[PDB]
Design a protein around this ligand. Structure first.
Ligand SMILES: [Ca+2]
Ligand SMILES: [Cl-]
Length: 231
């Protein structure tokens, strides 16, 4: 049995476990992204976290959005990690609900491990579920899959069920991907550690491309909640 261990329902404001990131990181958050993240692009409305991507000059960027993380505040080793999210559609938009290993501080990326619960690019009727890590050879490895999501503008529960042997991905309880991590095979030992959660919406980058449909801005990513259950 899964029990609720943490949540953020965004009932009246952003809960105490979120840290806001700002700026463009290093080379556009490692992916040549175009937005400058700001605290100001995240708000709560009608019981939802609202991350807004805007066409706005700030800090030398042409776009602003928000990126939030639970690093140093809430981290999890295994669990059913889920979020109820509604996505905007527009060329250049790249929302994500994901996780990074706590040890990012000492081992860097991808050695810290990364669990992309949900990512989407542009107007795609597909979302992705992916892991990134450093295999036994010390190479940037990744394993991922996609699933058809025909109304991404609607709410959908994006989740992973993560345990010592596997990571399973779900959209609305439909399993669409699985990776075996049992006994740390192919350098996946890094997924037996604690991970924090991130939410963001990037504008442009290596994955969605550098064309942006600016007529779809301001664009809102809506997160009704983030919940973590553990057995
Ligand atoms: Ca809510
Ligand atoms: Cl668990």
């Amino acid at each position: 049995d899964y029990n609720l261990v943490w949540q953020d329902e965004f009932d009246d404001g952003i809960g105490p476990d979120w840290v806001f990131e700002t700026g463009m990181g290093y080379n556009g958050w490692g992916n040549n992204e175009l937005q400058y993240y700001r605290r100001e692009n995240a708000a709560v409305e009608n019981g939802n976290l609202v991350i807004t991507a805007k066409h706005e000059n700030f800090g030398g960027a042409q776009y602003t959005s928000a990126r939030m993380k639970t690093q140093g505040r809430k981290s999890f080793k295994y669990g059913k990690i889920e979020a109820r999210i509604a996505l905007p559609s527009g060329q250049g938009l790249w929302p994500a609900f994901w996780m990074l290993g706590n040890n990012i501080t000492s081992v860097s990326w991808p050695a810290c491990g990364e669990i992309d619960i949900m990512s989407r690019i542009n107007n795609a009727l597909q979302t992705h579920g992916t892991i990134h890590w450093s295999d036994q050879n010390g190479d940037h490895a990744s394993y991922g899959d996609d699933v058809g999501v025909s109304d991404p503008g609607q709410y959908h529960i994006y989740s992973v069920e993560w345990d010592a042997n596997s990571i399973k991905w779900f959209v609305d309880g439909q399993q669409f991907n699985e990776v075996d991590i049992s006994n740390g095979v192919n350098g996946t030992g890094e997924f037996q550690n604690e991970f924090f959660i991130l939410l963001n919406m990037a504008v442009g980058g290596d994955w969605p491309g550098f064309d942006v449909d600016q007529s779809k801005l301001p664009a809102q990513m809506l997160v009704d909640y983030v919940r973590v259950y553990q057995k």
